[PDB]
Amino acid sequence: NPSLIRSESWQVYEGNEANLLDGDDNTGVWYKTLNGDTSLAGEFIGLDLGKEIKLDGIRFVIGKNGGGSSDKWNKFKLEYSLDNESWTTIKEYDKTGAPAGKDVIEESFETPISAKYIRLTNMENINKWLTFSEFAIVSD
Ligand SMILES: [Ca+2]
Ligand code: NA
């Protein structure tokens, strides 16, 4: 029963947050960002897994079709935590100039990674709102 965690200041402009956990790439959410339509570095979205589990991989789908198809971070990282206080980076991304629309962020770990929380986190201020479609883990 993983649940969504995300930056509290974002407003749900369209869609609904259950759409991010329904296993359908075609359903998403469009968040309005405050601070003058700016997502600041450190903002995040991901999963609280409820308990510490061994992860074999993740598959997160950022962006969505139509409205807000370009509304994505350009620099962000995948990180995990056991306690929701200390984080460890798995990968850093630069998707400047990525095509508009859904972008599948998928990683596989040869040796499982133990985590209770796992998320994408903005690395650089960007003057955009934000769309997402799906957050999933691969485990056990
Ligand atoms: Ca979905
Ligand atoms: Na799309």
Side-chain angles (χ1 to χ4, degrees):
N1 189 46
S3 59
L4 194 77
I5 59 174
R6 53 78 165 186
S7 293
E8 293 168 67
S9 68
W10 299 346
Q11 297 177 180
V12 180
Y13 172 60
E14 291 186 355
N16 97 280
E17 298 186 295
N19 286 350
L20 295 186
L21 301 174
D22 67 354
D24 187 348
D25 287 1
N26 294 335
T27 62
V29 71
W30 197 355
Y31 296 107
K32 165 177 172 175
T33 49
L34 310 187
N35 299 290
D37 315 306
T38 305
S39 177
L40 301 171
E43 293 177 12
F44 65 88
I45 182 156
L47 295 171
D48 171 351
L49 306 178
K51 61 181 167 192
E52 165 173 1
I53 61 182
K54 284 174 141 78
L55 296 181
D56 300 301
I58 63 95
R59 184 184 185 273
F60 296 173
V61 182
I62 70 172
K64 76 177 192 58
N65 195 73
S69 53
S70 291
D71 282 354
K72 299 171 285 181
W73 293 317
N74 287 326
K75 321 296 167 40
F76 55 93
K77 61 180 146 185
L78 174 65
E79 58 179 3
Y80 70 97
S81 176
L82 293 171
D83 61 7
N84 210 21
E85 291 264 35
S86 289
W87 294 90
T88 302
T89 295
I90 303 171
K91 199 172 175 182
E92 282 176 6
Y93 304 91
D94 183 349
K95 303 295 194 185
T96 310
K102 294 188 280 299
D103 195 355
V104 182
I105 312 297
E106 184 165 35
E107 305 294 342
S108 293
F109 319 134
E110 186 203 318
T111 307
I113 296 173
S114 291
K116 184 170 194 315
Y117 307 85
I118 185 153
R119 72 191 185 177
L120 297 177
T121 300
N122 190 20
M123 288 171 69
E124 185 177 61
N125 292 355
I126 187 171
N127 186 22
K128 294 195 177 173
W129 294 9
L130 299 165
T131 54
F132 299 97
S133 297
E134 201 66 39
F135 293 83
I137 59 150
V138 182
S139 174
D140 90 76

